[PDB]
Amino acid sequence: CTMIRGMVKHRAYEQALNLYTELLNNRLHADVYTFNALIEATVCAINEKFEEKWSKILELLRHMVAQKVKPNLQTFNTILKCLRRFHVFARSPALQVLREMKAIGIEPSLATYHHIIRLFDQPGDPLKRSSFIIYDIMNELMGKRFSPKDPDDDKFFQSAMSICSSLRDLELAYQVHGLLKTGDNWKFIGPDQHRNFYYSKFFDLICLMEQIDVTLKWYEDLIPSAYFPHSQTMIHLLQALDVANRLEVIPKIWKDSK
Amino acid sequence: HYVDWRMWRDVKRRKMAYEYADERLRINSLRKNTILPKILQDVADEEIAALPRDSCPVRIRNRCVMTSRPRGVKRRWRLSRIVFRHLADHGQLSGIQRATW
């Protein structure tokens, strides 16, 4: 178990395969984390197409079931991370994996939803497919306090808001922020860079869509209390103020710029 | 790196007295009673005399902890009168103030 996990961590995918072969020779049974590491090593070892990778992942899951080894959140998190490499094909089995999580009773965490959102974030139009996933994810997370379970949890909000900025959905951004500002969930905001990017996108979308009065209220509430605005964010705020013909605060913004 | 060799001697005396405090207490308790036989009290006397000279707590001198002044040291602050006056006059000591009544 530990040799496979370490070799996967150090990207010794061929060595991880050799360790898996040695495990099969010894006819021993691994655990859930070992199977997840094996899935990651198999996916990252070769540049095969989606069909081979998905067949191998399904075979590994069936082998884990045969070995009387029970699943965990890490399994589905790694499955989604691996499937992120093949967005076009993996758009379909992502919902199947999520329904498997629901049926087993393994409630998806913030990182699981983040990985699903990233998988649905295929380069191109997000309205076609992300509209079928983001609202359901928000409904599931709505009014739910969370605990740190997976290493990628902290990313979720950032990624979500980013695609929120893509969708130009002020209501969805408000729901995401309310999810962040619910109980202790704010602690999942992530590192300094993630926090800055999240707040920049959020305030940019507010300036783009929200009424200038509530826009100024959010400007007072967040800046500089939450983050220091970027020059582009201030430019967008100036544009929004100019659209709302409220030019009288333009010098004050310049003061704020200073 | 004490203030002077006198403070170093006092530190050595304090450490040695703390080391030998329990043995001295037991032997002296054997001595300071009228119950035990006088011969045992005499051997206890020679035992307590056999202990090193610097282990006696009476040799401990309360010197100022910042200038090694042997006299004029307030026990509460362990400071000489000059250093205590300096610190109080600058106001660095809480509560202490000039007395006028």
């Binding site: - | 902890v65 910042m66 509460r76 602050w77 362990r78 400071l79 006056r85 300096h86 610190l87 109080a88 006059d89 600058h90 106001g91 660095q92 000591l93 809480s94 509560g95 202490i96 103030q97 000039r98 006028t100």
Partner: protein, 132 residues
Amino acid sequence: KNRAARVRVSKGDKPVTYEEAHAPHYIAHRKGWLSLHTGNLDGEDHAAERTVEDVFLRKFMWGTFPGCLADQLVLKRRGNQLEICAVVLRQLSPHKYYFLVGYSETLLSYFYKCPVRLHLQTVPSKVVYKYL
């Protein structure tokens, strides 16, 4: 003549702060104590330990912030919490100030086994109460 903790007027040119301009007989009347701890109260112990710690803290913050402290420190003790409030000049760069704050806080906390905090109030120059 009394020479203790007094600034003697010579030409009316020497700038002095509020602390230096007041003689010791004004401590209870015009300038509160620079340190605040319960050790010197009635029935309280460890006055000498607090005094020694205060002296070390003053001599340590004076040398850790060379030419930066505008006036004498203010030491406050609340439970096991220790707070050093320092008026500092704006000569040094903020990066160095933050580095020194972190370093001094961590080192003092580990040395005295208490959660030391350091609050810096910056002034453009040493505030002059009067000239002597």
